[PDB]
């Protein structure tokens, strides 16, 4: 249950404050074998047998939060990663769907980690690209008498469309239109100074 940008909520594996008690059973059941009751031993042992996969889910959630907050900072990133994100989050939603299942836990843990790392690379890459483009929007008022830059921007958006063809996205024309919005705005300011030169 989270309240932040985009008005969405996070996905946190609850083993985060539980690994403290898991490590407690490791110390108190391996070092000396303290008076740990059977209910605690059974429940936290069923959690301790999943402990490496539980901490892997914890850190997959760390990457999930680190990139989903980036997704909620700008919906353009959401619509960017959207196609691969559909398969990524489809396998993730399948792992979220199965609740209290020791049989389907570990393979969906690996599915969650692989898909969240794919989503992590795509979201972080597209956010770094968008942050550099935003810094360019804040730093592109020192140019005059240029056509190669116009052809370069068109070729860059053409290469972005090629990247969209490689990593087939569901919301592909939406990002194509957003790239065209970047084209029209950047070339509008640049061509306005160009018209002053005209």
């Amino acid at each position: 249950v989270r309240g932040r940008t985009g008005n969405v909520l996070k996905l946190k594996v609850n083993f985060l404050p539980e690994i403290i008690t898991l490590s407690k059973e490791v110390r108190n059941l391996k070092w000396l074998g303290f008076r740990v009751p059977l209910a605690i031993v059974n429940k936290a042992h069923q959690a301790n047998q999943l402990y490496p996969f539980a901490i892997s889910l914890i850190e997959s959630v760390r990457t999930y939060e680190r990139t989903c907050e980036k997704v909620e900072e700008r919906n353009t990133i959401s619509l960017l990663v959207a196609g691969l994100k559909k398969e990524v989050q489809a396998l993730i939603a399948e792992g979220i769907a199965l609740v209290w299942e020791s049989y389907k836990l570990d393979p969906y843990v690996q599915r969650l980690a692989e898909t969240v790392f794919n989503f992590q690379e795509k979201v972080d890459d597209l956010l770094i690209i968008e942050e550099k483009i935003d810094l360019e929007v804040r730093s592109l008022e020192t140019c005059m008498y240029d056509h190669k830059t116009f052809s370069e921007i068109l070729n860059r958006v053409q290469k972005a469309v090629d990247d969209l063809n490689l990593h087939s996205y569901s919301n592909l024309p939406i990002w194509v239109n957003k790239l065209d919005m970047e084209i029209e705005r950047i070339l509008g300011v640049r061509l306005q100074a160009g018209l002053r030169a005209w």
């Binding site: 985009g6 969405v8 909520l9 996905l11 997704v71 959401s78 979220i96 609740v99």
Partner: peptide, 13 residues
């Protein structure tokens, strides 16, 4: 992640 998060919460229950 809004529509997918709502669907994932629905699948979570």
């Amino acid at each position: 992640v809004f529509l997918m998060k709502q669907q994932s919460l629905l699948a979570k229950q």
